[PDB]
Amino acid sequence: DLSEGYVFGMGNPLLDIIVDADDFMYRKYNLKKDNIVLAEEKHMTIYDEIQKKKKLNYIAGGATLNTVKMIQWIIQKPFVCSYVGCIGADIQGKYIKNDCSALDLVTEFQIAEEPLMTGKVAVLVSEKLRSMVTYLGAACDLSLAHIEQPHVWSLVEKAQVYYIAGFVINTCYEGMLKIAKHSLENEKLFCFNLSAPFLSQFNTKEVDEMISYSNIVFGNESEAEAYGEVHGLLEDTVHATARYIADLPFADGKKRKRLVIITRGKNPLLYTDSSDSEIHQFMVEQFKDDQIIDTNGAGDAFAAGFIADYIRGKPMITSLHAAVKAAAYIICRSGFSLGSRDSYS
Numbered sequence: 295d296l297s298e299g300y301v302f303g304m305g306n307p308l309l310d311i312i313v314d315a316d317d318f319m320y321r322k323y324n325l326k327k328d329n330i331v332l333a334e335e336k337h338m339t340i341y342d343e344i345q346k347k348k349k350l351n352y353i354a355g356g357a358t359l360n361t362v363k364m365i366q367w368i369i370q371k372p373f374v375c376s377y378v379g380c381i382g383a384d385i386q387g388k389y390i391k392n393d394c395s396a397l398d399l400v401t402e403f404q405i406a407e408e409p410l411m412t413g414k415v416a417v418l419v420s421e422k423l424r425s426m427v428t429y430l431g432a433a434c435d436l437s438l439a440h441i442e443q444p445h446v447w448s449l450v451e452k453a454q455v456y457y458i459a460g461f462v463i464n465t466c467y468e469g470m471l472k473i474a475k476h477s478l479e480n481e482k483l484f485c486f487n488l489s490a491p492f493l494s495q496f497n498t499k500e501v502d503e504m505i506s507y508s509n510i511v512f513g514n515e516s517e518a519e520a521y522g523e524v525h526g527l528l529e530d531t532v533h534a535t536a537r538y539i540a541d542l543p544f545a546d547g548k549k550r551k552r553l554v555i556i557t558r559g560k561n562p563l564l565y566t567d568s569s570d571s572e573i574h575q576f577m578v579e580q581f582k583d584d585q586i587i588d589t590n591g592a593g594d595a596f597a598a599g600f601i602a603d604y605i606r607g608k609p610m611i612t613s614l615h616a617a618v619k620a621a622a623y624i625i626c627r628s629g630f631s632l633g634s635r636d637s638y639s
């Protein structure tokens with residue numbers, strides 16, 4: 295029985311362009327498995343190149359948007375979740391806009407000045423590798439000015455739970471920082487996601503600062519290793535990282551518990567908190583090879599599944615099962631597609 299606007303999200307609204315990629319694409323653009331990179335000049339030809347390929351799949355993306363709208367989808371109560379992002383004045387942006395409205399998700403999109411187009415993600419899918427090349431585009435123009443608007447900042451003030459992916463660091467760090475301060479100041483729930491290895495390597499200052507305001511931190515194995523390496527944790531890196539992130543002081547120096555969850559693919563995930571001296575394993579649902587359709591967005595769904603239950607009072611273990619369920623649902627589907635709500639269970 296949550297009030298409207300209980301969950302607030304801010305991120306980069308993107309369009310996923312999913313394509314069955316040939317093998318040369320990964321050598322040509324120097325791409326790695328299960329990795330994401332921001333588009334540089336040497337990557338720019340990839341978008342025109344994949345349009346030459348048949349059977350393209352266009353579907354709404356954005357890490358934060360995926361999580362927040364699945365939370366809304368799970369709760370089934372209209373207008374519980376809110377989302378703020380920046381799109382372009384194109385058909386892609388309007389598609390994403392209408393996609394949100396269809397899920398009863400309250401949105402206040404910022405519109406970038408033309409001809410800056412809505413961001414896109416080149417999702418290259420193959421039997422051997424899966425990789426993403428992101429062109430942020432209009433998402434970069436997300437301003438603090440748009441957020442501090444009375445009709446937008448009111449969504450933040452009435453919210454009790456926040457989810458902001460680490461990806462937002464590249465687009466509007468000043469915005470997510472202001473919200474995180476507001477959350478800790480009013481003792482709210484701030485959920486943070488490490489999102490990608492490059493964020494811990496190249497934006498270590500921003501990641502650590504965000505952690506100091508975060509009550510819950512989500513991450514995976516590759517992110518934990520990247521984080522751990524930069525912090526000089528050369529042994530038991532994944533475990534040490536979980537302990538390190540959980541033990542970091544909050545910004546005000548006050549004593550709170552921070553929950554840290556690190557997923558590890560098919561292997562048992564890890565979880566712990568500031569008050570716990572131990573790191574626990576949680577075994578997950580096993581998949582066969584011919585059961586997996588697309589693991590893209592499984593982490594975003596995992597966050598949605600956990601939060602949706604955890605904020606409704608359900609205990610830790612139960613919430614972890616809900617998270618795995620959310621991820622498993624997405625894994626058996628192409629892209630981040632939210633189907634009929636009745637067919638969830």
Ligand SMILES: Nc1ncnc2c1ncn2[C@@H]1O[C@H](CO)[C@@H](O)[C@H]1O
Pocket residue numbers: 305306308309310330332354355356357358360415426428461462590591592593594630
């Ligand atoms: N740099 C980024 N910022 C926000 N979302 C992203 C970024 N890169 C990939 N994503 C999204 O992550 C999802 C998979 O977790 C995809 O749907 C994709 O759109």
Ligand SMILES: [Cl-]
Pocket residue numbers: 304305306307356357358359459461462
């Ligand atoms: Cl995002």
